[PDB]
mmCIF file with all atom_site columns, C-alpha atoms in Angstrom:
data_model
loop_
_atom_site.group_PDB
_atom_site.id
_atom_site.type_symbol
_atom_site.label_atom_id
_atom_site.label_alt_id
_atom_site.label_comp_id
_atom_site.label_asym_id
_atom_site.label_entity_id
_atom_site.label_seq_id
_atom_site.pdbx_PDB_ins_code
_atom_site.Cartn_x
_atom_site.Cartn_y
_atom_site.Cartn_z
_atom_site.occupancy
_atom_site.B_iso_or_equiv
_atom_site.pdbx_formal_charge
_atom_site.auth_seq_id
_atom_site.auth_comp_id
_atom_site.auth_asym_id
_atom_site.auth_atom_id
_atom_site.pdbx_PDB_model_num
ATOM 1   C CA . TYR A 1 1  ? -53.345 -18.311 -6.791  1.00 37.09 ? 23 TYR A CA 1
ATOM 2   C CA . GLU A 1 2  ? -53.563 -15.393 -4.362  1.00 36.55 ? 24 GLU A CA 1
ATOM 3   C CA . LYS A 1 3  ? -51.172 -12.506 -5.007  1.00 35.27 ? 25 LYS A CA 1
ATOM 4   C CA . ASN A 1 4  ? -49.362 -11.459 -1.817  1.00 32.34 ? 26 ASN A CA 1
ATOM 5   C CA . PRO A 1 5  ? -45.684 -10.820 -0.965  1.00 31.56 ? 27 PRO A CA 1
ATOM 6   C CA . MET A 1 6  ? -45.971 -13.231 1.986   1.00 34.72 ? 28 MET A CA 1
ATOM 7   C CA . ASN A 1 7  ? -47.018 -16.110 -0.306  1.00 32.79 ? 29 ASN A CA 1
ATOM 8   C CA . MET A 1 8  ? -44.566 -15.903 -3.223  1.00 34.33 ? 30 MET A CA 1
ATOM 9   C CA . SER A 1 9  ? -42.093 -13.377 -4.584  1.00 37.56 ? 31 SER A CA 1
ATOM 10  C CA . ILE A 1 10 ? -39.296 -12.759 -7.087  1.00 38.38 ? 32 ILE A CA 1
ATOM 11  C CA . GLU A 1 11 ? -35.958 -11.290 -5.981  1.00 34.88 ? 33 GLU A CA 1
ATOM 12  C CA . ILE A 1 12 ? -33.779 -8.939  -8.037  1.00 37.06 ? 34 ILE A CA 1
ATOM 13  C CA . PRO A 1 13 ? -30.587 -8.420  -5.979  1.00 38.22 ? 35 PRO A CA 1
ATOM 14  C CA . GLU A 1 14 ? -29.203 -5.946  -8.538  1.00 41.17 ? 36 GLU A CA 1
ATOM 15  C CA . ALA A 1 15 ? -30.863 -4.081  -11.391 1.00 40.29 ? 37 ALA A CA 1
ATOM 16  C CA . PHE A 1 16 ? -29.998 -3.827  -15.076 1.00 34.63 ? 38 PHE A CA 1
ATOM 17  C CA . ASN A 1 17 ? -26.870 -1.757  -15.703 1.00 33.21 ? 39 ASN A CA 1
ATOM 18  C CA . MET A 1 18 ? -24.338 -1.129  -18.464 1.00 34.94 ? 40 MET A CA 1
ATOM 19  C CA . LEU A 1 19 ? -20.572 -1.218  -18.066 1.00 34.36 ? 41 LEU A CA 1
ATOM 20  C CA . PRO A 1 20 ? -18.451 1.512   -19.689 1.00 31.73 ? 42 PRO A CA 1
ATOM 21  C CA . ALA A 1 21 ? -17.960 1.012   -23.413 1.00 31.55 ? 43 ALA A CA 1
ATOM 22  C CA . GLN A 1 22 ? -14.769 -0.783  -24.434 1.00 30.64 ? 44 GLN A CA 1
ATOM 23  C CA . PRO A 1 23 ? -13.193 0.643   -27.612 1.00 31.10 ? 45 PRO A CA 1
ATOM 24  C CA . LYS A 1 24 ? -11.778 -1.606  -30.333 1.00 31.80 ? 46 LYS A CA 1
ATOM 25  C CA . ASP A 1 25 ? -10.298 0.060   -33.442 1.00 33.34 ? 47 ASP A CA 1
ATOM 26  C CA . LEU A 1 26 ? -13.049 2.457   -34.643 1.00 30.43 ? 48 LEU A CA 1
ATOM 27  C CA . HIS A 1 27 ? -15.997 0.929   -32.747 1.00 35.41 ? 49 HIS A CA 1
ATOM 28  C CA . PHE A 1 28 ? -17.150 0.047   -29.227 1.00 35.36 ? 50 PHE A CA 1
ATOM 29  C CA . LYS A 1 29 ? -18.531 -2.958  -27.358 1.00 36.32 ? 51 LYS A CA 1
ATOM 30  C CA . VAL A 1 30 ? -20.997 -2.314  -24.517 1.00 37.67 ? 52 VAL A CA 1
ATOM 31  C CA . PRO A 1 31 ? -21.763 -5.208  -22.108 1.00 34.23 ? 53 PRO A CA 1
ATOM 32  C CA . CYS A 1 32 ? -24.858 -5.381  -19.876 1.00 36.02 ? 54 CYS A CA 1
ATOM 33  C CA . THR A 1 33 ? -25.556 -7.614  -16.882 1.00 33.29 ? 55 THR A CA 1
ATOM 34  C CA . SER A 1 34 ? -28.187 -8.287  -14.213 1.00 32.00 ? 56 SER A CA 1
ATOM 35  C CA . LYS A 1 35 ? -29.084 -10.697 -11.408 1.00 30.19 ? 57 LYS A CA 1
ATOM 36  C CA . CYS A 1 36 ? -32.187 -12.783 -10.724 1.00 33.74 ? 58 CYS A CA 1
ATOM 37  C CA . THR A 1 37 ? -33.409 -15.682 -8.599  1.00 34.11 ? 59 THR A CA 1
ATOM 38  C CA . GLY A 1 38 ? -36.608 -17.153 -10.060 1.00 30.93 ? 60 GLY A CA 1
ATOM 39  C CA . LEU A 1 39 ? -39.878 -17.826 -8.214  1.00 30.81 ? 61 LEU A CA 1
ATOM 40  C CA . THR A 1 40 ? -39.961 -18.849 -4.546  1.00 30.60 ? 62 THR A CA 1
ATOM 41  C CA . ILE A 1 41 ? -43.091 -20.261 -2.894  1.00 28.80 ? 63 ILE A CA 1
ATOM 42  C CA . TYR A 1 42 ? -43.087 -19.647 0.858   1.00 33.67 ? 64 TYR A CA 1
ATOM 43  C CA . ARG A 1 43 ? -46.599 -21.057 1.357   1.00 32.99 ? 65 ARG A CA 1
ATOM 44  C CA . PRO A 1 44 ? -47.404 -23.865 -1.127  1.00 35.72 ? 66 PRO A CA 1
ATOM 45  C CA . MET A 1 45 ? -51.059 -24.126 0.003   1.00 36.48 ? 67 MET A CA 1
ATOM 46  C CA . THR A 1 46 ? -52.182 -21.020 -1.917  1.00 35.52 ? 68 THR A CA 1
ATOM 47  C CA . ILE A 1 47 ? -51.514 -22.242 -5.486  1.00 32.21 ? 69 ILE A CA 1
ATOM 48  C CA . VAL A 1 48 ? -53.520 -24.698 -7.597  1.00 36.05 ? 70 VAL A CA 1
ATOM 49  C CA . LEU A 1 49 ? -52.269 -26.168 -10.883 1.00 33.77 ? 71 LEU A CA 1
ATOM 50  C CA . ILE A 1 50 ? -54.462 -27.402 -13.740 1.00 34.47 ? 72 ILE A CA 1
ATOM 51  C CA . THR A 1 51 ? -52.454 -29.469 -16.220 1.00 34.56 ? 73 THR A CA 1
ATOM 52  C CA . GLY A 1 52 ? -53.551 -31.212 -19.397 1.00 32.58 ? 74 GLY A CA 1
ATOM 53  C CA . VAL A 1 53 ? -55.774 -28.321 -20.499 1.00 36.35 ? 75 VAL A CA 1
ATOM 54  C CA . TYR B 1 1  ? 35.079  -12.223 0.617   1.00 37.08 ? 30 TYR B CA 1
ATOM 55  C CA . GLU B 1 2  ? 35.816  -8.528  1.106   1.00 33.97 ? 31 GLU B CA 1
ATOM 56  C CA . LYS B 1 3  ? 32.624  -6.466  0.867   1.00 32.47 ? 32 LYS B CA 1
ATOM 57  C CA . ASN B 1 4  ? 33.271  -3.309  -1.167  1.00 35.23 ? 33 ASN B CA 1
ATOM 58  C CA . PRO B 1 5  ? 31.364  -1.451  -3.924  1.00 34.91 ? 34 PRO B CA 1
ATOM 59  C CA . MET B 1 6  ? 34.640  -1.412  -5.900  1.00 33.14 ? 35 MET B CA 1
ATOM 60  C CA . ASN B 1 7  ? 34.759  -5.236  -6.062  1.00 32.55 ? 36 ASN B CA 1
ATOM 61  C CA . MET B 1 8  ? 31.210  -6.439  -6.792  1.00 33.32 ? 37 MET B CA 1
ATOM 62  C CA . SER B 1 9  ? 27.812  -4.814  -7.097  1.00 35.58 ? 38 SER B CA 1
ATOM 63  C CA . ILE B 1 10 ? 24.142  -5.195  -8.014  1.00 40.12 ? 39 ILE B CA 1
ATOM 64  C CA . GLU B 1 11 ? 22.188  -2.554  -9.957  1.00 37.71 ? 40 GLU B CA 1
ATOM 65  C CA . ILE B 1 12 ? 18.422  -2.046  -9.864  1.00 39.19 ? 41 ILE B CA 1
ATOM 66  C CA . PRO B 1 13 ? 17.799  0.845   -12.299 1.00 45.07 ? 42 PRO B CA 1
ATOM 67  C CA . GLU B 1 14 ? 13.997  0.503   -12.028 1.00 43.79 ? 43 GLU B CA 1
ATOM 68  C CA . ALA B 1 15 ? 11.937  -0.600  -9.035  1.00 42.72 ? 44 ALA B CA 1
ATOM 69  C CA . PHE B 1 16 ? 8.756   -2.681  -8.971  1.00 41.66 ? 45 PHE B CA 1
ATOM 70  C CA . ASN B 1 17 ? 5.750   -0.804  -10.338 1.00 38.61 ? 46 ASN B CA 1
ATOM 71  C CA . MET B 1 18 ? 2.267   -1.527  -11.664 1.00 38.02 ? 47 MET B CA 1
ATOM 72  C CA . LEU B 1 19 ? 0.276   -0.465  -14.720 1.00 37.93 ? 48 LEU B CA 1
ATOM 73  C CA . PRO B 1 20 ? -3.392  0.578   -14.873 1.00 39.62 ? 49 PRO B CA 1
ATOM 74  C CA . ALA B 1 21 ? -5.822  -2.305  -15.236 1.00 39.00 ? 50 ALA B CA 1
ATOM 75  C CA . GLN B 1 22 ? -6.921  -3.216  -18.762 1.00 39.47 ? 51 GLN B CA 1
ATOM 76  C CA . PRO B 1 23 ? -10.603 -4.239  -18.797 1.00 38.84 ? 52 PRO B CA 1
ATOM 77  C CA . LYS B 1 24 ? -12.165 -7.083  -20.773 1.00 38.08 ? 53 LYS B CA 1
ATOM 78  C CA . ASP B 1 25 ? -15.739 -8.388  -21.071 1.00 40.01 ? 54 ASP B CA 1
ATOM 79  C CA . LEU B 1 26 ? -16.235 -8.895  -17.331 1.00 37.94 ? 55 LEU B CA 1
ATOM 80  C CA . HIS B 1 27 ? -12.722 -9.046  -15.808 1.00 35.70 ? 56 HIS B CA 1
ATOM 81  C CA . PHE B 1 28 ? -9.426  -7.157  -15.627 1.00 33.19 ? 57 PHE B CA 1
ATOM 82  C CA . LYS B 1 29 ? -5.716  -7.771  -16.067 1.00 34.82 ? 58 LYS B CA 1
ATOM 83  C CA . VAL B 1 30 ? -2.963  -5.946  -14.192 1.00 35.53 ? 59 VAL B CA 1
ATOM 84  C CA . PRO B 1 31 ? 0.689   -6.232  -15.305 1.00 36.20 ? 60 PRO B CA 1
ATOM 85  C CA . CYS B 1 32 ? 3.789   -5.667  -13.182 1.00 38.04 ? 61 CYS B CA 1
ATOM 86  C CA . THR B 1 33 ? 7.344   -5.000  -14.353 1.00 36.04 ? 62 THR B CA 1
ATOM 87  C CA . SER B 1 34 ? 10.812  -3.962  -13.186 1.00 34.51 ? 63 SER B CA 1
ATOM 88  C CA . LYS B 1 35 ? 14.487  -4.017  -14.175 1.00 34.50 ? 64 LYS B CA 1
ATOM 89  C CA . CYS B 1 36 ? 17.619  -5.687  -12.810 1.00 34.42 ? 65 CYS B CA 1
ATOM 90  C CA . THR B 1 37 ? 21.140  -6.631  -13.872 1.00 34.08 ? 66 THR B CA 1
ATOM 91  C CA . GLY B 1 38 ? 22.505  -9.334  -11.544 1.00 33.83 ? 67 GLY B CA 1
ATOM 92  C CA . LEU B 1 39 ? 25.755  -9.490  -9.623  1.00 31.88 ? 68 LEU B CA 1
ATOM 93  C CA . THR B 1 40 ? 28.781  -8.039  -11.428 1.00 29.85 ? 69 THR B CA 1
ATOM 94  C CA . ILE B 1 41 ? 32.244  -8.876  -10.074 1.00 32.28 ? 70 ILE B CA 1
ATOM 95  C CA . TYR B 1 42 ? 34.832  -6.333  -11.214 1.00 29.99 ? 71 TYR B CA 1
ATOM 96  C CA . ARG B 1 43 ? 37.772  -7.897  -9.336  1.00 30.61 ? 72 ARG B CA 1
ATOM 97  C CA . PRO B 1 44 ? 37.269  -11.667 -8.922  1.00 31.84 ? 73 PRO B CA 1
ATOM 98  C CA . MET B 1 45 ? 40.373  -12.368 -6.806  1.00 30.88 ? 74 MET B CA 1
ATOM 99  C CA . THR B 1 46 ? 38.607  -11.173 -3.627  1.00 28.84 ? 75 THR B CA 1
ATOM 100 C CA . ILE B 1 47 ? 36.263  -14.191 -3.390  1.00 28.92 ? 76 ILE B CA 1
ATOM 101 C CA . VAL B 1 48 ? 36.994  -17.703 -2.110  1.00 30.89 ? 77 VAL B CA 1
ATOM 102 C CA . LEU B 1 49 ? 34.551  -20.624 -2.178  1.00 31.65 ? 78 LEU B CA 1
ATOM 103 C CA . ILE B 1 50 ? 35.210  -23.572 0.139   1.00 30.86 ? 79 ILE B CA 1
ATOM 104 C CA . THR B 1 51 ? 33.336  -26.519 -1.364  1.00 28.67 ? 80 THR B CA 1
ATOM 105 C CA . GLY B 1 52 ? 32.233  -29.763 0.257   1.00 27.61 ? 81 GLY B CA 1
ATOM 106 C CA . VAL B 1 53 ? 31.726  -28.361 3.764   1.00 28.22 ? 82 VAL B CA 1
#
């Protein structure tokens, strides 16, 4: 393929972050979350696949 | 009936109020509470109910 933002891209609407720690008895639980979308091909004439290799 | 605080009354010793939210993994819970007593009739001879109207 050819690497170019106008051919394909990956979107990250929000970045990795950590919520405030939640205390339980003498310890804490910290949850983390993020967002993603996958791979989007705007122009499908710039990629070639070779399967069965 | 005859409307008079001496005959019947309702008490509300505590009004509606909310508590701070209690977080969980990825959501919250908010509780609400209040107090009441219901109608108290000190002198019940000052009320007449006509039934079947």
